[PDB]
Amino acid sequence: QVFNFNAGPSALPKPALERAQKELLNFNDTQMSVMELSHRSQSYEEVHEQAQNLLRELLQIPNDYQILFLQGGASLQFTMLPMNLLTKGTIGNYVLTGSWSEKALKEAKLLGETHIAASTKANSYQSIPDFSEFQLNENDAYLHITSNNTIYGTQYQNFPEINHAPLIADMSSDILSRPLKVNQFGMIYAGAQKNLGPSGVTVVIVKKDLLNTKVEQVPTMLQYATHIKSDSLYNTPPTFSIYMLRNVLDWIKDLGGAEAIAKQNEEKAKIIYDTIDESNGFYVGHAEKGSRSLMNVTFNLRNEELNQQFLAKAKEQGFVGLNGHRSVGGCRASIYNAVPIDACIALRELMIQFKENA
Amino acid sequence: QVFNFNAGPSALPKPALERAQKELLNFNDTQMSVMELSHRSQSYEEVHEQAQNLLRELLQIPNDYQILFLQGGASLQFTMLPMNLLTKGTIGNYVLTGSWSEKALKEAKLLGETHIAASTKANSYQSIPDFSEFQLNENDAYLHITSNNTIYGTQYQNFPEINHAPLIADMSSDILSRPLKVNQFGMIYAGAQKNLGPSGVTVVIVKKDLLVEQVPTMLQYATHIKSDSLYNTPPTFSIYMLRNVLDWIKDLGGAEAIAKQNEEKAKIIYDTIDESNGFYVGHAEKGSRSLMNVTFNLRNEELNQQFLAKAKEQGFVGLNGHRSVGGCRASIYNAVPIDACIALRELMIQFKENA
Ligand SMILES: *Cc1c(COP(=O)(O)O)cnc(C)c1O
Ligand SMILES: *Cc1c(COP(=O)(O)O)cnc(C)c1O
Ligand SMILES: [Cl-]
Ligand SMILES: [Cl-]
Ligand SMILES: [Cl-]
Ligand SMILES: [Cl-]
Ligand SMILES: [Mg+2]
Ligand SMILES: [Mg+2]
Ligand SMILES: [Mg+2]
Ligand SMILES: [Mg+2]
Ligand SMILES: [Mg+2]
Numbered sequence: 001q002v003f004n005f006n007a008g009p010s011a012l013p014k015p016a017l018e019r020a021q022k023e024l025l026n027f028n029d030t031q032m033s034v035m036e037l038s039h040r041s042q043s044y045e046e047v048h049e050q051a052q053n054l055l056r057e058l059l060q061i062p063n064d065y066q067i068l069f070l071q072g073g074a075s076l077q078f079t080m081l082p083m084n085l086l087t088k089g090t091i092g093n094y095v096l097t098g099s100w101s102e103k104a105l106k107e108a109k110l111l112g113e114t115h116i117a118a119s120t121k122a123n124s125y126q127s128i129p130d131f132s133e134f135q136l137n138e139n140d141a142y143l144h145i146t147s148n149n150t151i152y153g154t155q156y157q158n159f160p161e162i163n164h165a166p167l168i169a170d171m172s173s174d175i176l177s178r179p180l181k182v183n184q185f186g187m188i189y190a191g192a193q194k195n196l197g198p199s200g201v202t203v204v205i206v207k208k209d210l211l212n213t214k215v216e217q218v219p220t221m222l223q224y225a226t227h228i229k230s231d232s233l234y235n236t237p238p239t240f241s242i243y244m245l246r247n248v249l250d251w252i253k254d255l256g257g258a259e260a261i262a263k264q265n266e267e268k269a270k271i272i273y274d275t276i277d278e279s280n281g282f283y284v285g286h287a288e289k290g291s292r293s294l295m296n297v298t299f300n301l302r303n304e305e306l307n308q309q310f311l312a313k314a315k316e317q318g319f320v321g322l323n324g325h326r327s328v329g330g331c332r333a334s335i336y337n338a339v340p341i342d343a344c345i346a347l348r349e350l351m352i353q354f355k356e357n358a
Numbered sequence: 359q360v361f362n363f364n365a366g367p368s369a370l371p372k373p374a375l376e377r378a379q380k381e382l383l384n385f386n387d388t389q390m391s392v393m394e395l396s397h398r399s400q401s402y403e404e405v406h407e408q409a410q411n412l413l414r415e416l417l418q419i420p421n422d423y424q425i426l427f428l429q430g431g432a433s434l435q436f437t438m439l440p441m442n443l444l445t446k447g448t449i450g451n452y453v454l455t456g457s458w459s460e461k462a463l464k465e466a467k468l469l470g471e472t473h474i475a476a477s478t479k480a481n482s483y484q485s486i487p488d489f490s491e492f493q494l495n496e497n498d499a500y501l502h503i504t505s506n507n508t509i510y511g512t513q514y515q516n517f518p519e520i521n522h523a524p525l526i527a528d529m530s531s532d533i534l535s536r537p538l539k540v541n542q543f544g545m546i547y548a549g550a551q552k553n554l555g556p557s558g559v560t561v562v563i564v565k566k567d568l569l570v571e572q573v574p575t576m577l578q579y580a581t582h583i584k585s586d587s588l589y590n591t592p593p594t595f596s597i598y599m600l601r602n603v604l605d606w607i608k609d610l611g612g613a614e615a616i617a618k619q620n621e622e623k624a625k626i627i628y629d630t631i632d633e634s635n636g637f638y639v640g641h642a643e644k645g646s647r648s649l650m651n652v653t654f655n656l657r658n659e660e661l662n663q664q665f666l667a668k669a670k671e672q673g674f675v676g677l678n679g680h681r682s683v684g685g686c687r688a689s690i691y692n693a694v695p696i697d698a699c700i701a702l703r704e705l706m707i708q709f710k711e712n713a
Pocket of ligand 7: 250253254
């Protein structure tokens with residue numbers, strides 16, 4: 001028995017993988033793998049377009065937004081965003097809700113003026129700040145948020161209404177886990193490898209008229225305009241990763257889309273949070289209740305010996321990935337879209353038995 | 359029958375793909391796909407390291423070089439290189455031998471002073487320039503070359519001895535198609551999708567001591583050197599597939615063995631051109647002919663199109679020349695089998711006979 005709670009890359013839906021396996025050598029009757037095709041072939045172009053069209057349908061992306069498939073991870077977006085929008089005289093304004101927020105801010109600092117609109121750093125990132133706390137500037141180039149703080153296990157419940165500057169979000173660890181009002185945002189980005197399949201592609205949803213203009217001085221590959229104009233085919237795309245993304249999106253659609261996956265995600269999170277909350281303090285969640293993530297459940301036992309013993313027992317029992325991020329310790333159960341509910345049931349049973357036997 | 363002459367992405371070895379298929383759902387008895395592993399897992403780290411190790415073995419890469427696995431393609435390397443090495447008061451010196459050389463030069467021009475050491479652009483990139491012609495500067499940051507000019511079908515036969523600045527090569531379309539003396543270079547880079555693997559990873563071989571205040575973290579070579587290409591999430595499946603391809607090259611006997619195969623493949627196509635009494639004409643001067651991309655045309659555009667149509671009908675994929683130049687291009691990277699080249703010859707001979 002294996003229970004895959006990996007935090008990134010992570011569990012994929014089996015039908016996406018079974019589909020890939022079956023056609024790995026002969027895709028679309030071509031007698032070639034999708035990995036062996038030109039990105040200008042009809043067979044690949046169909047995949048590339050269908051991945052865009054599925055994202056558009058599933059997230060209800062408006063027609064004045066474009067979907068980009070880029071290399072480099074979310075980490076490259078931390079620099080590409082300020083390179084394109086943080087112009088002289090303006091400010092990259094950041095809401096700090098975890099380590100990934102900090103990493104995004106650091107890159108902007110290398111390129112221009114920055115600001116902290118709000119932060120829960122002083123309290124170790126246990127919550128999302130109230131929107132009334134946000135300190136905004138008239139010359140903000142953007143306001144950047146991290147929707148799901150993967151290391152700390154906290155998540156935005158809803159999103160602020162920002163009118164003075166575009167709202168930008170790193171949605172790497174919760175994109176397409178629930179319905180989204182895309183028109184609240186100027187840009188959304190996500191490495192695919194948490195909730196959308198493959199590592200090696202980053203999905204960037206951009207309001208076209210904010211970013212389709214040449215930016216003086218910026219290298220060709222680092223301009224959003226390059227990728228918008230070329231439909232993410234300026235250079236050779238990560239064709240297998242985009243194919244796998246397509247397959248995962250087909251699965252999300254098949255299961256009922258964003259609304260259906262939100263229902264599933266709420267149920268399997270509740271299995272784990274109820275286990276914590278019924279444990280009389282034997283397990284302690286990091287997040288405040290009102291900010292608990294549906295995607296990454298972070299917790300500790302009462303001391304580090306017990307944390308070690310629990311994690312060792314989990315590994316013995318077939319659980320993969322439960323060690324917390326190195327920077328914070330404890331435990332982290334990553335329960336992205338494709339993690340099956342019976343893995344969560346199994347984790348509950350492990351947690352109850354370990355408590356009882358301690 | 360399908361014959362895959364695609365120019366990038368390209369044919370992969372059947373054993374590498376079959377291996378990937380067999381274990382796609384259960385890698386190394388983990389009951390997970392390699393795609394479902396954490397990149398901080400021992401399971402993935404072993405694969406990552408093995409890909410590096412096989413490259414090191416196969417190319418005989420000295421210990422004072424590091425092997426990086428990056429995202430962004432060779433095209434991102436066109437900017438990342440000058441971003442790291444083209445410092446104030448220095449020159450990015452380029453040898454132009456085709457369109458890919460021009461694209462690299464263009465990105466350096468945005469970031470600092472550039473220069474053209476030598477160029478065969480005036481004669482439509484039919485040859486590699488004589489090294490004795492290179493115009494070098496004391497303050498060169500580097501000398502950049504393109505080892506195989508993928509669109510023009512020309513290739514360096516050997517490499518210049520440069521010691522005033524590091525020699526840097528875009529080897530996208532010929533890396534690990536033959537032995538190399540890596541000590542001639544300060545840096546080699548290649549998108550994987552011609553000779554090494556699927557698209558989505560870029561191999562960068564860099565002299566460690568060669569390689570920056572103000573450069574974004576992801577765009578510093580130092581970041582990736584210090585983190586062993588695990589600073590952020592790597593393209594795990596692409597690196598796995600690279601490993602599988604490298605195991606296939608090793609199993610057939612390594613770089614000398616693949617070179618012999620590639621020389622035989624190329625010989626079949628060039629002999630067919632040369633024996634055709636001018637019905638097929640190669641673009642490249644004989645002395646510069648590529649072993650990786652064979653470029654040619656028929657005597658007029660109507661016949662070019664007729665030939666390409668017939669090829670497509672008979673199962674050949676990818677033979678249309680690059681749009682910028684027209685004609686035909688047979689890409690015969692490592693994993694393109696000799697039987698496909700034989701088949702292309704036989705098509706070419708029949709086509710001429712029926713013309
Ligand atoms: C993992 C993650 C990242 C980093 O993504 P890479 O693709 O590894 O660069 C950034 N942001 C968040 C919220 C993440 O979870
Ligand atoms: C294919 C090619 C490139 C472009 O590679 P991308 O991965 O598409 O950026 C660069 N240089 C040469 C010589 C090529 O053949
Ligand atoms: Cl975080
Ligand atoms: Cl993380
Ligand atoms: Cl070229
Ligand atoms: Cl090309
Ligand atoms: Mg369906
Ligand atoms: Mg089950
Ligand atoms: Mg030529
Ligand atoms: Mg072997
Ligand atoms: Mg002869």
